[PDB]
Design a protein around this ligand. Sequence first.
Ligand SMILES: CC(C)=CCn1nc(-c2ccc(O)cc2O)c2cccc(C(F)(F)F)c21
Ligand SMILES: CC(C)=CCn1nc(-c2ccc(O)cc2O)c2cccc(C(F)(F)F)c21
Lengths: 239, 230
Amino acid sequence: LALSLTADQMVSALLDAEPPILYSEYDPTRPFSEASMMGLLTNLADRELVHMINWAKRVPGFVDLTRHDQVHLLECAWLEILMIGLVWRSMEHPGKLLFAPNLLLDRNQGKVEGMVEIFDMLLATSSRFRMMNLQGEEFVCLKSIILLNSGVYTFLSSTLKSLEEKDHIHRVLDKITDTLIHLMAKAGLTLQQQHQRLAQLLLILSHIRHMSNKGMEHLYSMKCNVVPSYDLLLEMLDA
Amino acid sequence: SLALSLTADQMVSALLDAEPPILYSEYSMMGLLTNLADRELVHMINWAKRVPGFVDLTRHDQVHLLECAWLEILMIGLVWRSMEHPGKLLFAPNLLLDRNQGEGMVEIFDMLLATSSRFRMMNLQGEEFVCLKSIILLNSGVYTFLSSTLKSLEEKDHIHRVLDKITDTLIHLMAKAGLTLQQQHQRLAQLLLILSHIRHMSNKGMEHLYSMKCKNVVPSYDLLLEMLDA
Ligand SMILES: CC(C)=CCn1nc(-c2ccc(O)cc2O)c2cccc(C(F)(F)F)c21
Ligand SMILES: CC(C)=CCn1nc(-c2ccc(O)cc2O)c2cccc(C(F)(F)F)c21
């Protein structure tokens, strides 16, 4: 089971679980309009969705959850997860968001003003990871943490099983924390640097939550989808 | 620079000394929060000026931090107040609400409750608490300064440096309470992850103000700037 993994076995499992990078619908009309871009982002996200489920089911400890909790965690975290993907992808492309390898946009290219604030936010984050020289093995830990953390406070409670599930999530989070710290020691950071890096990394998740909330906000503000329903996800979950 | 030299114990002591008082609700739900919020904000600005590192920022930077953190700061105070009242939110000593007295915003109410209860199972400590509060003041708005000029870059480093001193401070508090090296970093992580949840609740909150046509209760950049300058 998942709580038994060493830190080395946790990084390995997480690396192996990695989803693939997808391409954007090939050769769209350029220049873009506001909706054409959104049609492209939306299409891409939907296609990534399928793969994130495959990825989520291989996150040590995810499967031990009832289906209901697996869905609720994904519901809450999916955009955050895409967004950290993006920001990772974009690190060595100052000024640009690499949504797909055939879809690399600067702040002017794509066609709203609330959108450009998010874009700006994604760019900032990406620089920050670049500044911190974020490592791949750290990124997979962070992405996993996002998955297990984002929706855990809103399980709601009561029943003993509801408490068990929350307690299990929290224990997996702890091993991921042990894993991050292990990577940091391994790399030769002092304890003090280790603690500090861990904090700096985790604080960034709060910004990623914020951006997701902003993004979700916008998504709900179109008369179109375009946001995976509970049943959609449940289904996608049964093997 | 001052702030960067503090010890873990001096940092905590500065932070406890700076705590706002707990105010009473003076005397519709939106009515009561607005009355309370408005009075609390005055105190929050004076608390903020006392957070080590914070006055070393430019006034425009102080304002942006506050503008970004204000609801999360209210909210976290609320969760800490309610910690010892499971099932209830202690808005004020004379305004302690249960889930059922909770029109819209029962979602936010529930989340608030869940956070409080998370606090309670964690045995969250007053000293840890004040450290998290400060972390939020300095973290929530730092990624959106605007870099550009040399100053804005110097301001960002300085914030990150203070944040690191709050990190050392939390760890010190845990090492001193007896936690093992392992338990220290797991607890530091559990603490900070909760902050994502607070951000989340704050955003839902704002969302809810705008759909209540209550956009007005928000402190504006200029409102904030005038209060700081006093
Ligand atoms: C241009 C802006 C402000 C984007 C925010 N955003 N980002 C992605 C996304 C899709 C795939 C991916 O891998 C990573 C992503 O971040 C995305 C997908 C749908 C809607 C939005 C939104 F929120 F803008 F409406 C999205
Ligand atoms: C100005 C307004 C109404 C903000 C909205 N607000 N304010 C507080 C809050 C206020 C003061 C305080 O001491 C503690 C609090 O938690 C609060 C708590 C729960 C939900 C909301 C909601 F949904 F309106 F955003 C809240």
